[PDB]
Structure 1
Amino acid sequence: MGTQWRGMGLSLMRLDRFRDSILRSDEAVKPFGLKVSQLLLSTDESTFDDIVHSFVSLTAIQIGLIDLLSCMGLRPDGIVGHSLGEVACGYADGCLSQEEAVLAAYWRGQCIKEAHLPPGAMAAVGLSWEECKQRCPPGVVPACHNSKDTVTISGPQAPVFEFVEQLRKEGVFAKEVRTGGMAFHSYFMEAIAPPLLQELKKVIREPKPRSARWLSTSIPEAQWHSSLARTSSAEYNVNNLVSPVLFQEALWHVPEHAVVLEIAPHALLQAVLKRGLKPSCTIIPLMKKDHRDNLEFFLAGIGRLHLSGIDANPNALFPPVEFPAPRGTPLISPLIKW
């Protein structure tokens, strides 16, 4: 969450595959009155205020990007998610279908909206995970283990704000991310669990096994043999929504000399990956906020993928060119230099 910007994904709509994927997501989420394309097109800034639209559109854009990547043949070797994003990770790994993933995202948003819980702010602080948790005032818990250097804390609005101000008095890094006014992964989210569990059981019918490629971030490492971590059921989603995100813990498992692609409508976690991932790895955004035309940025990402040794054919993205080729096409033999 947190990487939703006005007009996200409009440039990619021109590509046939991405537009078809967005239409499929819309048809998936038709009964609830949400039209993904309509949400993307709306110009008013209010569209992203309601968390339902934000979550649904974010998941849809990630699914569309994964469809684009899979079109060229790129098969991921690993997968790491962050808060909501396991659903996108679920689809990328293959444990979930597009309809099921979009339904899960929308019902997460719906359940969270129904909560009507007291406002609780979640902000990031520059202190360390171990040190901060002791320093956390009662009722406030670290939000996400982004990295050793930077960690975010989520909790009740008043305690979070007071602690952030005191830390600023301490000079440490202070920032409250736009979280729709609701704290996340705290005991506050525990209220929404039952209805979410029942609705997701109604949504997901036949859970399927997880893969070794996927590295769950809602379950500590030692527990990867548990029943919840085995398959992506309602328990997996609830755990990913309740417990804090162990984003950094999964980065220690990234082998040296690896290509890391940020599947998101904004490479927010680029700094976290750069600092907490081994220097040998390369980071590629695949999309940026308020860029003039995101198709160029996606093509630049694919080009950097080409430069890094990973084969990817950009022909699949665009419509096929009919052969035989037109008479008079420039010769290719003279260009090959040895």
Structure 2
Amino acid sequence: VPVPVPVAVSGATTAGLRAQAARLAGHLRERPALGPEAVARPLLLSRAQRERRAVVVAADRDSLLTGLDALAGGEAGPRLASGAADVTGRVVLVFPGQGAHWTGVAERLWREAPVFADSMARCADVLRDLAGWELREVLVDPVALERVDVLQPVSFAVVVSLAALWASVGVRPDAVVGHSQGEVAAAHVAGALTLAEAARIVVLRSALIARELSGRGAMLTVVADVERVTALLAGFEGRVCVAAVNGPASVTVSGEDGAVREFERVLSARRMLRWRLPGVDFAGHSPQVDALRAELLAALGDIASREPEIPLLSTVTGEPATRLDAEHWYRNLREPVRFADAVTALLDRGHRVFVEVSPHPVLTTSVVDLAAPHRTAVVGTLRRDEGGLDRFLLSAAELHVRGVPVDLARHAGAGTAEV
């Protein structure tokens, strides 16, 4: 099985970029034995990366030529990224909470990317010690993944390991933000928690949720702003509450299933878009969480933590995080998620590059909404049913084409074939 490489072309203008694509395709067609793995390294290391950039992520000739022909003709393609190389500013890794995971994600990438494989095995060790079960087995088990005590720790492992893979291609956060359980992954990646201690928090909290809350609630994201949602929650006081404010067109609510179904009728009649959060059978960030406080604080006890080596913008407060103690990790579950606030605080401090470290993008559209009118690059990592190194590289390419530093050459192979 051939391995995907990022094949980069650029020009000073979009027309020059398109002509360069045509030229390369022509050169490949004149040389039938020449593959993407022969040409990719010199196209990155021996050519100027100009103002208008593209990458085709391809493992073979035919797929490269398909990408290049699309690019030459000004069309989109599924493994073609292109852009203006005009983004500057600091880099944020965003860690999602619920609703991004898809069954079977991470297995293919474990096979394909040794850095990700390594991180996942390091996670597996810590989770074996804690939860008993074997991370790699559970990745492909749709029945186990509907259990909150399995899903949350698996989800944590996958996003931490994706962050390691980003780091291996030179994409390191200047700041991090984690939504809901993402905050624990963010804290670890920022150096405030060991892998072991972060894992312990996710494992103990998720198991408590599964014992006490699973089956008693639901969560719903709505395409609307918080003012609008709050107005529509008139008469739902103490039944359905605001659980997250993600942006101007994304607010999540929480409560008992029946009560949330009543609220969905309110939204439906009014032609508003909404969906249940996948993987979530509990009323997160609601008064239902009060009953869990005492057992959670006892289970967690004293948290071993240190000062984050880079800023961690909490979604508990919308501000740089203070003590990451047991009380903080309770509030991370009880209190509404201030995701919009956190992202806004980062935009106001010169952050312009946001990398959602997730199996499928769930918060990128909010980051894009919040970032306007600033010049920004916002990307995810994987997508539903696209869990290969090829998809990871396309996301890295999406940063490269906007002028963000990323070491695509790490995965470009050992080609010496020129022009």
TM-score, length-normalised on structure 1?
A: 0.85
Q: Aligned partners of 1:167 and 1:107: how far apart in 2? A: 35
Per the alignment, residue 236 of structure 1 pairs with: 328
Shift of 1:275: 2.0
Q: 2:296 aligns with which of 169, 181, 196?
A: 196
Q: Aligned partners of 1:6 and 1:264: how far apart in 2? A: 13
**1:275 matched to 2:374:** no
Per the alignment, residue 11 of structure 2 pairs with: none
Moved more, 123-132 or 279-288: 123-132
Q: Aligned partners of 1:177 and 1:28: how far apart in 2? A: 27
Unmatched runs of 5 consecutive residues or more in structure 2: 1-97
Q: Aligned partners of 2:379 and 2:214: how far apart in 1? A: 37
Q: SS of the residue aligned with 1:79? A: strand
Per the alignment, residue 287 of structure 1 pairs with: 382
Q: SS of the residue aligned with 2:345? A: coil
**1:265 matched to 2:359:** yes
Q: SS of the residue aligned with 2:200? A: helix
Q: 1:157 aligns with which of 254, 257, 266?
A: 257
Deviations 1:298-327 (A, max 9, x none): 111222222233322245569x98xxxxxx
Per the alignment, residue 237 of structure 2 pairs with: 138
Q: Aligned partners of 1:142 and 1:285: how far apart in 2? A: 26
Per the alignment, residue 11 of structure 1 pairs with: 108
Q: 2:126 aligns with which of 28, 33, 56?
A: 28
**1:254 matched to 2:346:** yes
Moved more, 261-270 or 134-143: 134-143
CA contact (8 A) 2:318 2:339 kept: no
Q: Aligned partners of 1:288 and 1:157: how far apart in 2? A: 28
Shift of 1:59: 0.4
Aligned length: 314
Q: 2:151 aligns with which of 37, 51, 54?
A: 54
CA contact (8 A) 1:190 1:242 kept: yes
Q: Aligned partners of 2:308 and 2:154: how far apart in 1? A: 25
CA contact (8 A) 2:176 2:310 kept: no
Residue identity (%): 27
Q: Aligned partners of 2:253 and 2:405: how far apart in 1? A: 40
Higher RCO (CA-CA < 8 Å; seq separation 6+): 2
With over 3 angstroms needed to count, the CA separation of the structure-2 counterparts of 1:208 and 1:168, relative to structure 1, is same
Q: Aligned partners of 2:392 and 2:214: how far apart in 1? A: 39
Q: 2:314 aligns with which of 210, 216, 225?
A: 216
Look up the equivalent residue of 1:125 and give its one-letter code.
Answer: V
Per the alignment, residue 81 of structure 1 pairs with: 178
With over 3 angstroms needed to count, the CA separation of the structure-2 counterparts of 1:234 and 1:245, relative to structure 1, is same
**1:306 matched to 2:400:** yes
Q: Aligned partners of 1:107 and 1:59: how far apart in 2? A: 13
- Higher normalized strand content (fraction of residues): 2
Q: SS of the residue aligned with 1:146? A: strand
Q: Aligned partners of 2:248 and 2:323: how far apart in 1? A: 29
Consecutive aligned runs of 4 or more in structure 1 exceeding 6 Å deviation: none
With over 3 angstroms needed to count, the CA separation of the structure-2 counterparts of 1:18 and 1:331, relative to structure 1, is closer
Shift of 1:131: 3.7
With over 3 angstroms needed to count, the CA separation of the structure-2 counterparts of 1:34 and 1:317, relative to structure 1, is farther
Shift of 1:249: 1.2
Q: Aligned partners of 2:213 and 2:353: how far apart in 1? A: 41
Look up the equivalent residue of 1:251 and give its one-letter code.
Answer: V
Q: Aligned partners of 1:131 and 1:307: how far apart in 2? A: 37
**1:94 matched to 2:191:** yes
Shift of 1:247: 1.0
CA contact (8 A) 2:354 2:377 kept: yes
Per the alignment, residue 104 of structure 1 pairs with: 201
Q: Which one has the largest radius of gyration?
A: 2
Q: Aligned partners of 1:264 and 1:270: how far apart in 2? A: 10
Q: SS of the residue aligned with 1:104? A: helix
Q: Aligned partners of 1:66 and 1:126: how far apart in 2? A: 28
